Design a protein around this ligand. Structure first.
Ligand SMILES: Cc1ncc(COP(=O)(O)O)c(C=O)c1O
Ligand SMILES: Cc1ncc(COP(=O)(O)O)c(C=O)c1O
Ligand SMILES: Cc1ncc(COP(=O)(O)O)c(C=O)c1O
Ligand SMILES: Cc1ncc(COP(=O)(O)O)c(C=O)c1O
Ligand SMILES: [Cl-]
Ligand SMILES: [Cl-]
Lengths: 399, 399, 400, 400
């Protein structure tokens, strides 16, 4: 369409780069999803999916939908209209989840934080202490707010729920974190965890992956919200029958997920988490060398999947995004809603290595000069490469 | 996984064969859906999509979902809980749509027909005549029942509604018909028409395409059903903003749809419809030469996208499907629910030519012999090839 | 997408052939550095596995980035010197083209000619070997499978005559349209240079000319005074020793493609692949018999299970059948070449193709025969093929 | 997926190079019948468009299914006879290998040698032309861009000396690592045979050796007594007349790939591609200067915009830099070959690659230099390149 020379530099926090082996696995004609091959393939995907959530008790569902669809499935299967939810508004995507909760006629207790801050767990503790009659039925929290680069502590939420002996369900949006940050469903007692295929899993859009605890499944018996396409029970019915699929899945995405999981296990989930931590640290060091500000306001909330960069008031962050596309064949994340024009976002998420990031960072330095910001050329690249030269591990397959 | 020699013969009525040019168009890395390229691509898809529905007034929506999801979008955007619907139970998929309607708390007047018969429009006429107060808010009808190979006359439904001056909405499932059978949204006054990508469009699963009339859009103002992921209003909001996408689409399916539409227009929609008619006629001639019975009970309901073949009571149609897979590398459609074991289904839908079908038909003759049915070898192939030799047009690009 | 037609194109020429989906996937890749550690490691496994399809433990394979005609040229220039006497057999277009090349490289070719549709004249070979008391015949150049005629030669019979007369001539065999489809036993038959092309039964794109040389062939390179650089085996042998294998740049995509192709061949089983080709060839020949047409091959001992050359009656132009197949049925059939131009058309049945694919082609040919005015009985050829195949198609082991 | 590493592999060897996504898509296809009407129609357009990248209206192109070394061989055997005197210039590994081939084909090669890092010695050429009163020199064989050294020769200067002495020798130019990256003017320079390979600036897989011959070169085929069949131009010219173009099977996938590659070249613009390569080469040379290392190229008139050969100090092994790049950074750099083995490493910058890709590589090289104990100032080379590129990168026209 709008071709540019060389390889496009995709550094938005989703969709992310797809590894070549996964592209190959998806390069295939359709197949009959009622043939014996697809149920056999599906069975291996469900079992291996539990490993990336770090659950042995959870039941996964591979919905042909997006992350927004995964949201809807989590809410309508476990809750009823009028049920009271506590959720945390800290950015665009936590906001959009709350907008959805209200639109599905749930009573949402919204706990707001300034953009760049994490969930206000003190207000949470206060609301749980005062909930004698257990009216709060669920906590809905985004693990990683993609709009601001803020990661919340899920274990602290569990500590509060257990401290007050509160039975509320814990629903966690891990779209921007699972397979990039550490995520421990069982240890944290997460009841519904969800992610999307186009983030750290490094696949096309089209899978909304939902993992439910035994507690979450028992809650479906009481749930009076309406659902059909997103109903877990129809999937459970076909799991028992051995066919798994109540309606047609995407054959290509299933084989793609098989190849993505194989690559994840070959690198090692722990090594993937460490890789993201290196990339995020390197990016944050570059941002400080530029004299710019990370939108995250405290170190405890730093995000290793995206860095939201604040520019001074005379610089338009949207112009930085526009110039990256028009001149450097580079995709950067826009500042959304409240931070529109005030930030641009560097995604460091999924299948990406250090030299790819350094190319992006070098390009940002040229863009900032184009818009009149007085950056010392190479200062951010040098801060990142100096740190990375100490920590990049050798590629095991090549030792 | 379970590899077999040669090319797999995919003759289920969905998913269907993907043309090589479409496979190539989808062979690509992710892209930023907020970059200028994707809105530009999307605009051309929405405009060209209207041509296959044969609408100039309708508004299309490209949902990242399946046909079942398209169903849900059509119902929750135009109707409210408790609203009275008339629907026709004639097969598995019309049944599943009714199951969904009931699960979303609509009052469904179910008009049942025996499997192999079309919608009972006499009962419909009777119910419309008696609806003085216009309590019936919508008619939900499957255009082509994939489980039985039955095509209903949509124009007759419009004739009845107009005769009685009845304002009910007309929602039509065209998953199994659009781009294969003739479909005229505006002429028939269809208010919501929907199809899936994995049928005649010959794409992977993952797009539920919904097209709404101005009347359908006005009904959203009154609709009190709950929806977020399937809400048309959020799409309309982003159409006006010029970004089109309220959440992430599948980049690969959008480019795939662009290539699929280009191929459809190059062959010509009218020529595609005639091609399907040839394949269906050829299959029905072969079934009679075999001495077997078409499940469709009257000629007026014949389907040119799938032929449901009835076997005698001592033959297990599921064994025919099983042997096709294990020995001939051939996928045939199973008999579903009420016709389980009594039929098998030959799909002739999407991007498939005459020699492909003749290969399938020759294989069925060998399978029937394997299960003890006394078929005269070549009798069905000969009946089909004798008819096709008179009607196959020359390939225009090669004249 | 040029000259697009609906549905999948039916490729039934005897080369290039259909590529299995997994092989297409394997080649769907960016370039890689051929001097990086990955490519030598990959090449190592291909050379060892390629020996299996030749059925040799003695031979040394070479994966030339070239076509079948280039493999021809390397076979000749590495083992022979100008003026060397060669015995070759003209039985069709491709045995003719090899002989044309032999002459153009200034070899003294003794041409043993047969009618098109017949195999090599071994009685004439015997007398020539019997008269060659001073061993002036340096090589026998014979095509294993003549793709223009559908004729397969008995390679073991040539080795028998060579051994009977105690003649030391090298045995150079073109197996472009036979290896991995017909049985081929390099060591058992004492073949000194065997060659094939990637776009035939291997079911790959064009671009690899695969040559396998016996120790005697390698010994012959020491006395060979023909000129060669691109096709020189010694350059490959040197880089084999060095461990990097490639004296110049190979096709990265074809190396990975060949890896996937060999994996599929070993999964199905080579003996099972040979049997599958036997089924397809017999089914096709039965269809031809049912149609009332004639096989170009004149005797049963010469029938080819990779291609069938069909002779049409005098009032039909075989080229019209090929054109009609392309213009109306999205079907590719082989033309009659040179001597048999217009008198025949060719149905290729080799590589990764199954029985229902072939039956679709055969059904299409019946419709074409009707188009061009041949009084075919519709279904007669399909019924003969299906009646036979319903008895012999094995169950797919992967599906129990 | 062998020896897998995270993220995208950074391919910065000077061949094979990165393939544009649309070209990968174009080659993602099953085989087709090369005797069907589609392939000749496609080939027709490729031959006419290929002339544009050579900047010739007189020349005849040939798309051989071979590598650069095969294009070499065809250039020689079609225009020269054994014993013919050739003047060639040994300035690096690939000019050396061509000379090695010239000798092995029994030509009388007059070798004009220069130190690695220097261009062709034209003063010696002048004296040789001046002494050749009887026109015994039949051809000048010169490499346009020596990929082993990063040295570009002035082809127009050779034509000037040829015309000054009124010498009729043919001008054979290797443009494997120059055409579609550096400027190349076949007609203006009077080049008689120009050749390139697909895996270089054309940004395709290996498998096409593209040769373009002037009318004088074609006239020379009439007197050429070198032996050739696979590489013979006359076989192609005959099928050109017949309208089918191919004397043997081509690679279907590479034909469609070349179609897409040429479409991309015309869309960006050839002059814009030449300018882009100039930017990448200058940026790389600036980085090298900032690092305190030396360019192997000894004079500014010889600098190459397709590859930079970097000389390392005596306490560093250049091969260790290449190994480290592969083992830790998923980066492919070029080795120093033969004479400059261990003394240099090579950064390739040609084909479909943009500035941010190069800058990522340059940033990686700085980290490698630190690993092997070179006192590099982190960011110094990136800053020099970025400071220059921020001035010269053009806006992408497709994006207004
Ligand atoms: C944290 C988070 N949740 C939810 C979403 C919505 O996902 P999708 O666009 O796939 O609907 C996103 C964005 O992709 C996200 O970053
Ligand atoms: C007529 C009809 N409607 C609806 C559906 C359901 O579509 P999907 O499987 O994509 O959810 C099908 C089957 O695909 C169908 O044939
Ligand atoms: C038996 C035989 N030998 C040689 C050749 C020539 O091979 P290629 O076209 O790959 O150069 C062919 C044609 O494919 C052939 O069938
Ligand atoms: C200038 C030059 N000439 C010739 C060659 C040899 O070409 P090939 O490796 O494709 O045979 C090369 C290497 O690519 C080269 O760089
Ligand atoms: Cl042929
Ligand atoms: Cl090189």
């Amino acid at each position: 369409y709008m071709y540019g020379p060389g390889r496009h530099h995709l550094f938005v926090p989703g969709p992310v780069n797809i590894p070549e082996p996964v592209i190959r696995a998806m390069n295939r004609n359709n197949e009959d999803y009622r043939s014996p091959a697809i149920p056999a393939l599906t069975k291996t995907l469900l079992e291996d999916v539990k490993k990336i959530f770090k659950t042995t008790s959870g039941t996964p569902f591979l919905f042909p939908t997006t992350g927004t669809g995964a949201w809807e499935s989590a809410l309508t299967n476990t809750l009823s209209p009028g049920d009271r939810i506590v959720s945390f508004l800290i950015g665009q995507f936590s906001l959009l989840w709350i907008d959805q909760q209200k639109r599905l006629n749930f009573n949402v207790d919204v706990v707001e934080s300034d953009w760049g801050q994490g969930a206000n767990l003190q207000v949470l503790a206060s609301k749980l202490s005062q909930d004698e009659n257990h009216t709060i039925k669920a906590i809905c929290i985004v693990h990683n707010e993609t709009a601001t680069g803020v990661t919340n502590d899920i274990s602290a939420v569990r500590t509060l729920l257990d401290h007050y002996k509160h039975p509320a369900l814990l629903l966690v949006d891990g779209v921007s974190s699972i397979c990039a940050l550490d995520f421990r469903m069982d240890e944290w007692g997460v009841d519904v965890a969800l992610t999307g295929s186009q983030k750290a899993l490094s696949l096309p859009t089209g899978l909304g992956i939902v993992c439910a605890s035994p507690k979450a499944l028992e809650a479906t018996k009481t749930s009076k919200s309406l659902k059909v396409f997103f109903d877990w029970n129809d999937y459970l019915k076909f799991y028992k029958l051995g066919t798994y699929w109540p309606y047609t899945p995407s054959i290509q995405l299933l084989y793609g997920l098989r190849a993505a999981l194989d690559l994840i296990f070959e690198e090692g989930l722990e090594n993937i988490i460490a890789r993201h931590a290196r990339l995020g640290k390197a990016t944050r060091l570059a941002v400080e060398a530029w004299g710019l500000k990370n939108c995250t306001q405290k170190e405890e909330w730093i995000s290793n999947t995206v860095t939201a960069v604040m520019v001074p008031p005379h610089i338009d962050g949207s112009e930085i995004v526009r110039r990256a596309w028009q001149r450097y064949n580079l995709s950067l994340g826009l500042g959304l809603n409240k931070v529109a024009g005030k930030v641009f976002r560097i995604g460091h998420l999924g299948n990406v290595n250090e030299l790819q990031l350094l190319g992006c960072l070098a390009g940002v330095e040229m863009i900032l000069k184009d818009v009149g910001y007085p950056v010392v050329m190479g200062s951010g690249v040098a801060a990142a490469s100096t740190y990375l030269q100490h920590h990049i591990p050798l590629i095991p397959s090549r030792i």
